[PDB]
Amino acid sequence: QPEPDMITIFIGTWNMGNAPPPKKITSWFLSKGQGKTRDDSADYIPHDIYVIGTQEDPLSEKEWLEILKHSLQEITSVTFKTVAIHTLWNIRIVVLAKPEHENRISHICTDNVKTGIANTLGNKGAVGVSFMFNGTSLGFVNSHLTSGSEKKLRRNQNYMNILRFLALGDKKLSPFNITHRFTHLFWFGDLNYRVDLPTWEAETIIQKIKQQQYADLLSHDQLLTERREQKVFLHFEEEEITFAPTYRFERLTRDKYAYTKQKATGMKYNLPSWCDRVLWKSYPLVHVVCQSYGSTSDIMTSDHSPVFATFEAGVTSQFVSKNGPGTVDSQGQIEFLRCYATLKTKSQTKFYLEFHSSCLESFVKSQEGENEEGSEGELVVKFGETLPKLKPIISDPEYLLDQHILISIKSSDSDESYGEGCIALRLEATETQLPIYTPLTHHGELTGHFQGEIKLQTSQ
Numbered sequence: 001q002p003e004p005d006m007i008t009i010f011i012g013t014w015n016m017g018n019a020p021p022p023k024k025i026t027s028w029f030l031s032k033g034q035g036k037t038r039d040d041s042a043d044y045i046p047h048d049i050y051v052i053g054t055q056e057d058p059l060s061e062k063e064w065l066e067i068l069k070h071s072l073q074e075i076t077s078v079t080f081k082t083v084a085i086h087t088l089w090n091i092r093i094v095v096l097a098k099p100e101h102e103n104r105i106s107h108i109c110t111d112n113v114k115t116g117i118a119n120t121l122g123n124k125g126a127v128g129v130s131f132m133f134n135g136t137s138l139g140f141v142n143s144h145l146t147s148g149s150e151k152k153l154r155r156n157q158n159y160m161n162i163l164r165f166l167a168l169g170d171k172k173l174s175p176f177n178i179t180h181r182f183t184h185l186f187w188f189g190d191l192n193y194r195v196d197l198p199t200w201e202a203e204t205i206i207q208k209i210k211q212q213q214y215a216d217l218l219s220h221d222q223l224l225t226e227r228r229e230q231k232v233f234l235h236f237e238e239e240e241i242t243f244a245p246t247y248r249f250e251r252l253t254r255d256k257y258a259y260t261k262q263k264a265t266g267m268k269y270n271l272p273s274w275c276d277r278v279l280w281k282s283y284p285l286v287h288v289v290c291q292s293y294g295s296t297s298d299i300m301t302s303d304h305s306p307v308f309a310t311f312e313a314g315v316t317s318q319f320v321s322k323n324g325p326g327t328v329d330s331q332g333q334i335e336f337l338r339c340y341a342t343l344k345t346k347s348q349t350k351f352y353l354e355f356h357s358s359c360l361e362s363f364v365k366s367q368e369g370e371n372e373e374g375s376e377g378e379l380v381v382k383f384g385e386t387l388p389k390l391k392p393i394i395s396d397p398e399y400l401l402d403q404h405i406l407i408s409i410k411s412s413d414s415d416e417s418y419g420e421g422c423i424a425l426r427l428e429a430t431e432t433q434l435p436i437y438t439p440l441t442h443h444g445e446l447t448g449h450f451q452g453e454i455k456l457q458t459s460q
């Protein structure tokens with residue numbers, strides 16, 4: 001039975017509004033309703049992995065697991081296995097997989113982050129799950145961010161706290177946050193970003209939604225505008241939105257948006273908004289294709305509609321050679337030429353690099369770079385031809401060209417990372433000098449760039 005080179009992943013996010021679900025929720029898992037929907041011809045084809053994020057979830061873990069498993073069983077006639085379940089307050093993540101993936105899934109981690117302080121600590125935050133699927137690392141984050149149209153900067157801060165403090169994936173990747181630890185990272189939830197238009201325009205917005213004319217609404221979506229201004233979710237992707245706003249509905253119908261200020265809302269307006277979102281970040285040149293992104297029309301117990309997204313994702317096999325794992329493959333090497341880091345820092349410490357990759361036995365520390373003053377004020381750290389030669393555990397090009405090198409640039413004085421990035425080994429040529437580039441981030445914000453050339457030698 002061959003190992004797969006692709007899997008499909010279902011991502012669901014649903015703010016349940018503290019109400020039990022209706023008896024039938026299959027439309028969610030089938031990607032049916034509004035937006036980019038799944039073809040009917042696929043209905044009986046199970047996804048490989050289902051990741052369900054809820055917010056304001058009133059059910060016990062046992063109650064929700066039984067509903068989810070019975071739902072998937074009805075759709076597919078497959079009894080899915082529970083990979084992980086983790087709950088913080090009323091924010092929950094469930095990961096289910098085809099039982100045929102029992103010996104492909106390992107290194108399962110869960111964690112949560114509570115956002116806010118004092119007044120604002122006690123119901124918002126995030127849960128997450130990671131695991132390995134054969135040679136591929138997968139991370140999943142369900143976050144419930146701060147509510148309210150005038151709190152976009154709070155949401156952005158909640159995002160930064162979650163990606164700093166959520167402890168998933170390989171702890172040996174010590175300089176790296178969750179935005180670098182996974183081949184594929186999916187981040188979803190009630191992100192709570194709103195359509196920033198004046199309150200007086202509520203009925204105009206409703207009209208536009210009835211016409212399915214979303215362009216003038218999406219141009220004011222706070223998540224899209226904050227992303228475009230690099231304030232949040234830097235280097236994440238989102239499919240185009242082609243479904244109506246998923247909040248705030250009168251319960252038991254989808255015919256009415258309930259937007260007016262009420263004592264129950266803290267006298268706040270809830271203009272129709274795309275609160276409920278799925279974004280992703282995959283390592284460079286790894287296959288990932290969104291195959292659905294939409295909302296259900298027939299699940300009406302909450303003031304939010306469920307959101308679905310599905311993906312094709314590239315995966316690699318757990319490679320064994322005659323040599324690695326447990327030795328090097330002399331026949332392989334990774335060389336770096338004309339390399340320099342450009343950093344936004346005002347500091348003047350010496351810097352060194354660390355190279356981390358599951359194609360290395362352990363991470364590799366470089367010598368210190370040579371600091372120069374860049375012409376527009378920046379710091380340029382030159383490595384030139386000084387970087388170590390990396391010795392992969394396996395030299396087979398079918399393995400090595402699928403790998404990635406994580407890079408951290410660290411202060412010699414504090415051993416703190418000033419920037420993290422990722423280089424793909426999926427090169428156009430081997431034994432050939434080729435340009436490489438990554439942006440560098442720290443705490444998920446841009447701090448610089450790393451560029452140079454690479455020379456990859458495989459067994460072929």
Ligand SMILES: C[C@@H](c1ccccc1F)N1CCNCC1
Nearest residue numbers: 224225227228229235236237238
């Ligand atoms: C242009 C930018 C963007 C697109 C639509 C909305 C917000 C944005 F920031 N992309 C972000 C993801 N990667 C490629 C570039």
Ligand SMILES: C[C@H](c1ccccc1F)N1CCNCC1
Nearest residue numbers: 081083097098099101102103105
């Ligand atoms: C429970 C879990 C599992 C079973 C089926 C499908 C996926 C999955 F992660 N185990 C992983 C490690 N090996 C034993 C099984």
